[PDB]
Amino acid sequence: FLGFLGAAGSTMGAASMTLTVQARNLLSGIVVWGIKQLQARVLAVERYLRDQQLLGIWGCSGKLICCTNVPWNSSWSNRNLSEIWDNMTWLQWDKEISNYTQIIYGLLEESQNQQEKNEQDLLALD
Amino acid sequence: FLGFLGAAGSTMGAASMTLTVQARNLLSGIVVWGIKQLQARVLAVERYLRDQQLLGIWGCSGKLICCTNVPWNSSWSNRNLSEIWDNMTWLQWDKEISNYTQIIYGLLEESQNQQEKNEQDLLALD
Amino acid sequence: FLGFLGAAGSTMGAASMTLTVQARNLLSGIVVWGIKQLQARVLAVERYLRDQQLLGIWGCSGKLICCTNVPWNSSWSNRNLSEIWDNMTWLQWDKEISNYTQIIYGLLEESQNQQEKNEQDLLALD
Amino acid sequence: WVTVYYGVPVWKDAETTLFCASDAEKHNVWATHACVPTDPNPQEIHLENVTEEFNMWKNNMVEQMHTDIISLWDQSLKPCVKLTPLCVTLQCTNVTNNITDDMRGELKNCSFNMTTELRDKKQKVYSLFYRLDVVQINEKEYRLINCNTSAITQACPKVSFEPIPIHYCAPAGFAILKCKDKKFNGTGPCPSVSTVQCTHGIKPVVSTQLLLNGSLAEEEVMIRSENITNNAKNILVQFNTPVQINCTRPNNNTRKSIRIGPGQAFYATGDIIGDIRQAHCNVSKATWNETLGKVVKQLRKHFGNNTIIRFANSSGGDLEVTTHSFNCGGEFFYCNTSGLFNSTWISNSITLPCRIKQIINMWQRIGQAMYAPPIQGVIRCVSNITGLILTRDGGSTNSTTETFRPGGGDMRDNWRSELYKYKVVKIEPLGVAPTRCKR
Amino acid sequence: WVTVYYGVPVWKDAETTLFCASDAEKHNVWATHACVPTDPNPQEIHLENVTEEFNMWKNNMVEQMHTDIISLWDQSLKPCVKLTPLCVTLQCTNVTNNITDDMRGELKNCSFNMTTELRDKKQKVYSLFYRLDVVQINEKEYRLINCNTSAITQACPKVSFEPIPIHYCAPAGFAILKCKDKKFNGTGPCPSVSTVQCTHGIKPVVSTQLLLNGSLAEEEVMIRSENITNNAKNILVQFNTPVQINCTRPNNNTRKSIRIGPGQAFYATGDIIGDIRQAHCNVSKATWNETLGKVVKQLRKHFGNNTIIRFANSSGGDLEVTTHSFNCGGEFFYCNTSGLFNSTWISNSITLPCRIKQIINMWQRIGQAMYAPPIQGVIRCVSNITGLILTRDGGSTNSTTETFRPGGGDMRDNWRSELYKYKVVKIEPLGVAPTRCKR
Amino acid sequence: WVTVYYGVPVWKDAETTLFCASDAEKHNVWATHACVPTDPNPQEIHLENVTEEFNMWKNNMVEQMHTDIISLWDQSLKPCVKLTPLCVTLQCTNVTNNITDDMRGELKNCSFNMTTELRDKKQKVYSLFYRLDVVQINEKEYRLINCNTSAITQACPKVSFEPIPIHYCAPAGFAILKCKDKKFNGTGPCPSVSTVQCTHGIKPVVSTQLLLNGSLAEEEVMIRSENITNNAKNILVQFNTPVQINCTRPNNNTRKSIRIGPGQAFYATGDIIGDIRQAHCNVSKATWNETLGKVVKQLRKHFGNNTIIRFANSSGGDLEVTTHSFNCGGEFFYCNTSGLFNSTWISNSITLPCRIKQIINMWQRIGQAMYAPPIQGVIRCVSNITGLILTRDGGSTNSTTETFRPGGGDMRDNWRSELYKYKVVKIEPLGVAPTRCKR
Amino acid sequence: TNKKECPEDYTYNPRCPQQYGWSDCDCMGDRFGGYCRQDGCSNYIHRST
Amino acid sequence: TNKKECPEDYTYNPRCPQQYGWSDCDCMGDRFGGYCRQDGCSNYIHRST
Amino acid sequence: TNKKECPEDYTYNPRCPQQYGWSDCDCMGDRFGGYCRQDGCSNYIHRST
Ligand SMILES: *[C@@H]1O[C@H](CO)[C@@H](O[C@@H]2O[C@H](CO)[C@@H](O[C@@H]3O[C@H](CO[C@H]4O[C@H](CO)[C@@H](O)[C@H](O)[C@@H]4O)[C@@H](O)[C@H](O)[C@@H]3O)[C@H](O)[C@H]2NC(C)=O)[C@H](O)[C@H]1NC(C)=O
Ligand SMILES: *[C@@H]1O[C@H](CO)[C@@H](O[C@@H]2O[C@H](CO)[C@@H](O[C@@H]3O[C@H](CO[C@H]4O[C@H](CO)[C@@H](O)[C@H](O)[C@@H]4O)[C@@H](O)[C@H](O)[C@@H]3O)[C@H](O)[C@H]2NC(C)=O)[C@H](O)[C@H]1NC(C)=O
Ligand SMILES: *[C@@H]1O[C@H](CO)[C@@H](O[C@@H]2O[C@H](CO)[C@@H](O[C@@H]3O[C@H](CO[C@H]4O[C@H](CO)[C@@H](O)[C@H](O)[C@@H]4O)[C@@H](O)[C@H](O)[C@@H]3O)[C@H](O)[C@H]2NC(C)=O)[C@H](O)[C@H]1NC(C)=O
Ligand SMILES: *[C@@H]1O[C@H](CO)[C@@H](O[C@@H]2O[C@H](CO)[C@@H](O)[C@H](O)[C@H]2NC(C)=O)[C@H](O)[C@H]1NC(C)=O
Ligand SMILES: *[C@@H]1O[C@H](CO)[C@@H](O[C@@H]2O[C@H](CO)[C@@H](O)[C@H](O)[C@H]2NC(C)=O)[C@H](O)[C@H]1NC(C)=O
């Protein structure tokens, strides 16, 4: 309907939250002269898989949107949720928070690790 | 035991529902002269991954059988469940319902998108 | 922190259970002269995917640790849990139980197949 | 309600690239260093309560077989020495004295002005040739017959063309289905389905007229064609019994090398020890007698139940298709099969003379003539005919008598004669079905 | 709280390898057997409420275009016959009698001592040549002019250089963005964003001075350069109107082959039927008149609003860049464009003579000279100029008058003239945002 | 109960293909345009409380090293000019006048009848050669010595053989383990485990007898062999100290090119400026003195604690292994090391003359002789011996004295001398363990 | 109007009539793989232009 | 100290002054792709050593 | 019965005794990489047929 990047101009609250993110942006993600052709296929595969492994380690596989139990750090960006979601888009958003990406990835991993650990303790004592 | 396509003649209710589908049909799915050899490996990878991404978008990853909340449309095929499952097989079945495949895939995607959306609203209000 | 195999000497109870297994051992798993370069990429992809498919068939995708309902067979190795987990490591452990790997994989598959079957019966009767 | 299922044992017709495999060295041109090991064990699974539709005339496995063979053939000459320096005027006479009449005029004794590794002096050399590779220049003076068409390369005497069987194997997601049926004749459904990872091994034997070293029919001679009334199509006849042929190259040859250049040498026929005899094949006569009768009965069943059938030898034309062609020991043989096709079957030992050539344009390509070096000693070959390539004369409505002739030319048909047992399909494991269950 | 989102329509600038595609044979050198089919339908999606920044001078699509073209060009000669045996002393005189003055001294009639497939005797042959490919040896005796620099290979007369358009396509995870803007001049943001799977097709036409067979500007002539004050940079001028040129090779040629060796033959110019005429191009005069004026108005807007502009012909130097170069029918033309650049625009039919060559060192490489075989008959070519490559004279501060000359040399600029519409980006679908939701 | 775990830091011995990397141009034959960048930072992780078993004699990293080097060597000549036209009879005499006795008979001054780009006339040229590449034809008349064995190709004077270090890197799922142990001698467990993504860089230096430009032992000279009592195996001796050698090619050469053909030229030795001197190497005498003593003490520890050890020079045979061989500046040197192995150690400056060759059959293959073009000026080389390749005489039970000689021949051992520090393993992250937990 | 087209299962092969002196042999049966045979000979599809 | 370096957008091309007899033409504009032109000529960057 | 086999770590190399005139040198040590040396010489494994 909107097309692969069609939702880009609709601000985050509509740009991805309409599941346009799944319908095309994600669906298309993995959709001797000719050496280049194998290289392209392989690299596309690798990128797809890296995204999935990250979702996997964070406990977010099988989801378009995945909430965690990690609080947002306003130190990375302090804005109201209504402006963040309704007037700003994803490209603009990344421009503002790109520098905190690695911090959050580390936090996400540790949280998931602790969550699983706690479940493991609960089973042991069940 | 039965072999990769061994269950094909057992009608759907036994042909796949015995988990023969997992045991072999799925397990085997991803199991300068030699250029062909890379091409074959790459293509096998791509097919495997396309299936997984579709299951992913439908909320059916990690399942052999996945029920959704989409009603069956009898307009695509009107038969009793007992004949569908016990006397007819999967190949015969596809011959009858192949033309509705795309309709259902679209419906599955939209339903999953709405289901996730509803969960997101529930968390926001929790 | 500890590095890719950094936790290897910490005995199983710390070697993997600290989620060192995820942080690096797993994270790194998928991280005409130059033919070798494609071969290497492809093979790495295949190994990664085989592991994921096995976790998938066992109902353990999206987990670092996955408990099942299959009892341990002491016939494969009879030790107390405290020694198994606190003084022995994973390499030593595999040396002791490698011969039972295939037995357990078959058991895991059948159990998952039955578990899903039971859920399918419950939905039918719901 | 809709339920999604994965791992469904369902498939569609498909075309993909298959793997070659052998033997679950640098010798042997047919990919023995290139193919992978075969699976050590058969993985055949019979499928009950299923049927499948096959069409050997629409198969693609044969295109790969064709492609692979031509490619391997070409690769085998890539590192080999070119014979460009050899096409010179030949000063040439007949081989004589020891010829036992039959071979008169067949062998030539020619002199050459050849290069040496030092690029200045030439050497005077001579060698022997079959007349079929030599032509008169001025209507004495002779030339290599293929000189004025295209480049000639010497095969490296490291390898041969031994037809080591190759198994074809499916990539993951693919499977090969086979009929275990006996009545199936190449098209339509067969009530027999069995799935394998790989085909059995097929020997890449290249021949005309008589299909050699292949599989046999189990119960009846099977006759297959794309269109039974189309005289522009060939006929594949699969025997249910072997017919043995004992062939020979009855000349004790001596080979010599001539240095041509810095790392190059030409392998020349030196001479013949003892006398000179014509090459030939000995076909069991009694077997041919019965075999033909069986073929005729089956032909009659398709057409001509109340008519009679005659066999005749080949038409005039290119040697490559007017005679029987085979390779053995690496040598190239041309045999006169007219002695096999000189009869009428109305219901109610055979010696075939042969010829030998050294310049072979296999697959009819330009710049790819191959020179077959001499083989020393004497060659014996034993094999069975497993089938025939036949054509039927048109130009007549007089149904009283049908006329058949041996054929061959397009190699695809020889491969088809083995490959027909198999079909390639692709598995499509993901799909849906109605249920009474909802998430 | 942190929420993780996947499938976000966000991207970064990126460099990757693109796929070539055409036509949603073994003919045509420009990958027609190698590229994949194009998508049968445009997939263009306009994106609302977005802007994007482009810089055609920093693009990498052009490097691939360059790389691909050079590679394809080289591949086309790999299987072709080398002309090494041809560089011999030529015994040579002038072509005469039928020359209509203009061509005097242009054609040579030379004799050779050539090889034959038999490596002993030689044949006495002769053929015709353009003087531009022939040089005197001793200051009669002539040689192929490129003999003393590098190897020459004959193009196989199976293929030509017809500029069949190629579409470039993104791999999954990539997309190509395009401006639909009219004011955009190659750099900076444009308020127009549209995403495609593939670019439109671009014809790989190789030329100097005049850009042929390309796209046109829609509203205004667009003039683009990397640096408007840098006289070391070229200028790309994109016309909003075509200028038609009718070119001819007015000589009814006869071609003959000379057998050289075992599978090799040289294609020689035999002779000319009828008289001999100079090659030329007919440019619409009226169109050029108006076209130039439009170009000047736009140049004035960038600089020189109150100054005047003159055009002058090229500087002394290598023919390849001092004249207009093009290929048509497979033939290589060199045309004198001075008749197009001999004026001053102060505000307030044209016949171009041409020359022909047979030895082309395309891309200036050693051991890659290509011999263009003769084409029989008479050649007509019709095409439109879609733009110009201009340079501006430096060495002066007298702003009263600016001087421009036709340029060309680095082919990258011709490709840039079409590719500038596009940018390649990589999609990065995984990211986070603050929410009020927690697991 | 069974619990499934993923990401377990466990591994098995494995064989895979490693990546080559360098320098986290078209110059340098050893893959500098082909290998990827190294990681900019060491990723070494020490593993505590673990041990591992190594066996340098069963390693596969060395096979890849071998394979890669031979392949790169061959690739470097693929685009280069063949010297086929050069093997002609040489009319040849001795170089004289300026020879300082030692070089008498070593240099030849030969005349040739060479081709020109015009394929008709020849040029009379002459050049200088080392006698080792020239042989008398008729027992004056000379030929290139390798002419009668195989083809010779000129190395392109664009590249050299400078041994730029290459790092080997694991693919994902693999890791390389290293010992940091000091007592480990190539086999068995070492109580030291450290894991890396990549090995350190190894310089692909090719030599015999003396191992040059390698790593040093830290505490003791280490002596390693597969079997200490097997006299059919070599011995690798790793010094804990360098021994410097100053080598020279003391001849101020002038090189000239001779045009051979259309894009081909031969690089010929022109002449020598000043007088003519023999090539040689200056070995520190004092260092050798002490170094040998250390080697002997360690040999004694393995065997011979109460016996004495003598060193002797090499056996008769092929120059390639009877002398010390190295390359420097691209030049090929053969040095007489007998001055280093002429002593007995009973406990209780050195000048080596050298020879030079231009035709090198590296790796002993047919059709791969390489011609090393002259290098102008004078060459100086400075490097350290890091180890030895020794063999031990058999044929005696008289334990009183053992005899050792310098060896070398199979290049695998030189690579092993560096690679031994590493092992390749494959990670198997998925497995199970007993728990008290159930789903 | 029409063209001198060969019937299905035959292609055009000028070599055969020239090499052999065969009448009414413009086209050659595809069944012989490009090789020339008298019984593989055919003329063009019999239709006027 | 300095070197005889060409100005940006020009490279060194000894062929041009030799082939053509052009004065003050050591460097050639990159804009011409390696081909020689009088207006593409330049001397070296004007600085002493 | 037996064959003229070389001992382990030696292979057969007819070049060496011919090129050098070496007695009792049929086999050559593998340790020398195919190159010929007097101390690398060996005869065949000493067993009768
Ligand atoms: C149908 O199947 C038959 C069953 O295998 C095939 O028969 C085999 O055919 C080969 C000849 O093509 C027979 O002869 C073999 O020849 C090799 C000789 O090569 C080696 O020695 C020479 C000596 O100079 C050397 O130059 C070569 O490089 C090799 O080193 C012998 O080594 C073998 O022992 C054997 O003699 C086989 O005997 C024969 N098999 C049987 C069971 O008779 C038959 O050819 C197939 N049909 C066709 C058309 O190929
Ligand atoms: C700009 O676009 C124009 C539009 O297409 C291009 O014009 C086309 O240019 C070609 C010539 O380059 C014209 O002529 C064609 O020539 C082929 C001849 O080749 C075949 O026959 C010869 C005979 O011996 C044989 O040797 C060859 O192998 C081929 O078998 C003809 O078959 C065509 O019918 C045609 O005559 C086109 O006519 C012309 N198109 C138009 C619409 O006029 C123009 O060339 C482009 N600009 C540039 C610089 O290429
Ligand atoms: C052990 O490690 C040593 C440390 O690097 C190695 O020493 C280096 O060896 C090279 C010679 O092989 C020395 O000389 C260099 O030579 C190049 C010359 O090439 C360029 O110029 C010529 C002129 O005609 C041209 O033809 C070429 O294409 C190149 O353009 C010089 O440019 C360098 O400045 C240098 O002179 C190094 O000096 C030397 N290094 C040191 C620190 O002395 C040693 O060779 C290694 N051992 C072995 C056996 O290789
Ligand atoms: C195939 O059969 C035809 C006819 O049976 C043979 O034709 C003979 O060819 C020779 C060649 O010189 C002629 O002398 C004969 O007169 C021909 N026969 C007739 C009846 O005309 C043909 O040679 C046969 N081919 C083979 C291999 O036997
Ligand atoms: C290696 O040692 C042997 C013996 O020490 C040397 O043999 C000498 O070879 C020359 C060659 O003409 C003979 O004249 C001598 O008589 C030989 N010596 C003996 C004792 O027979 C051999 O040359 C040495 N190799 C080197 C490089 O020194």
Residue numbers in the entry:
A (entry chain B), B (entry chain F), C (entry chain D): 519 to 541, 560 to 567, 570 to 664
D (entry chain E), E (entry chain A), F (entry chain C): 35 to 58, 64 to 141, 150 to 186, 189 to 309, 312 to 323, 323A, 324 to 398, 413 to 503
G (entry chain I), H (entry chain G), I (entry chain H): 99 to 147
Quote the passages of the study that discuss this structure, keeping the authors' original sentences:
Here, by x-ray crystallography, cryo–electron microscopy, and site-directed mutagenesis, we structurally and functionally elucidate the mode of binding of a potent bnAb (NC-Cow1) elicited in cows by immunization with the HIV envelope (Env) trimer BG505 SOSIP. The most broadly neutralizing bnAb isolated from these sera, NC-Cow1, had 72% neutralization breadth on a 117-virus panel, with a half-maximal inhibitory concentration (IC50) of 0.028 μg/ml.
The crystal and cryo-EM structures of NC-Cow1 with BG505 SOSIP.664 reveal very similar binding interactions with the distal surface of the knob domain contacting the gp120 CD4bs. The glycan at gp120 Asn197 is visualized in both the cryo-EM and crystal structures, albeit with a slightly different conformation, and contacts knob GlnD15 and TyrD16 with 115 Å2 of buried glycan molecular surface in the crystal structure and 150 Å2 in the cryo-EM structure. NC-Cow1 Fab makes two interactions that mimic CD4 receptor binding. NC-Cow1 paratope residues include GluD4, AspD5, TyrD6, AsnD9, ArgD11, GlnD14, GlnD15, TyrD16, TrpD18, ArgD27, PheD28, TyrD31, ArgD33, AspD35, and the disulfide between CysD12 and CysD32. PheD28 at the paratope geometric center is buried in a shallow pocket and flanked by ArgD27 and ArgD33, while the paratope perimeter is composed largely of charged and polar residues including many Asp, Asn, Glu, and Gln.
